[PDB]
Amino acid sequence: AGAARSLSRFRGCLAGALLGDCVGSFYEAHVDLTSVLRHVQSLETEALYYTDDTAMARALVQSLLAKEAFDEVDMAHRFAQEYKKDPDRGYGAGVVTVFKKLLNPKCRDVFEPARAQFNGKGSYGNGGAMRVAGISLAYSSVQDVQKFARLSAQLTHASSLGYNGAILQALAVHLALQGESSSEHFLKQLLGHMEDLEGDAQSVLDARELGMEERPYSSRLKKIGELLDQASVTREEVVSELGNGIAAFESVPTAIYCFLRCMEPDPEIPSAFNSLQRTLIYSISLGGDTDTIATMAGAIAGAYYGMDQVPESWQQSCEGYEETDILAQSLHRVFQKS
């Protein structure tokens, strides 16, 4: 609410992400709309633990705040120390190898452990994107959002399939912080940026080496546009065309679709729930990697709808919600310079 990049949008963004992670984590790797509507009834303190999505998002934001800038060695070290402090947050199986290499003080090029992952091709998991929302709070221009979404993602995700998913998620939060938009304008801006990135020769090769379609994020954003004009869209159709998995390309477009779809009321979700709430409910109903898809749709929706749509009863159920709010306020003061 309010002006572009307002305090309310900053707070709402990080709280929306935290709600998505904590509430989504109950359905992790499973889901039906009726049973989700039953499960959110228990939300009406800090009993819901957060996962790696929030742990890494907190480390990313604390690094930006400590250096008032992107610092790859500070951020890599905060990622690795956060893992060491609490390894049981539900990290991806591969990225733990990156953390353990970063914890070796002999490692003096912090981008190289990510590049060795998966036979030297790098991870395409959604972990670079799940934590990226703070980049869009710290940087206002598209150029800087792309640049540091990429760099922060590359600390663990060296494949363009992974870091371009982080950029797409950061760009979606960047646009949501600007306020009112049609769904079709929002989508068209994202598609334009991804078509530009996916023209790059390294992206084309990464996609071809995996057997994927030309311009994979651009293709899925086009599928979102078709789905948004389609009659009687079912959850099975959404999952079939966009995915609900741990790969960045099977979850980041899915999160954006959930945001865009839920800009309008849904007769199947009770009207007592506000727009942020129905986005999270809809996201979780897709199943699959629910904590990460919901954390990403929640970061976008929180930035768009602001803190007045963050319900106190939901927020106060989440582990660390006060520290999340303080970090959002600090980003607004330090980087937006209020």
Ligand SMILES: Nc1ncnc2c1ncn2[C@@H]1O[C@H](COP(=O)(O)OP(=O)(O)OC[C@H]2O[C@H](O)[C@H](O)[C@@H]2O)[C@@H](O)[C@H]1O
């Ligand atoms: N290039 C690849 N080739 C084959 N498998 C891959 C590749 N990249 C990723 N995977 C598979 O993808 C897995 C995860 O990639 P990881 O880089 O460990 O970590 P994340 O941070 O992205 O975690 C991704 C999500 O998974 C959990 O739900 C987390 O909470 C995240 O939400 C690998 O173990 C591989 O099996």
Ligand SMILES: [Mg+2]
């Ligand atoms: Mg998680």
Ligand SMILES: [Mg+2]
């Ligand atoms: Mg996950």
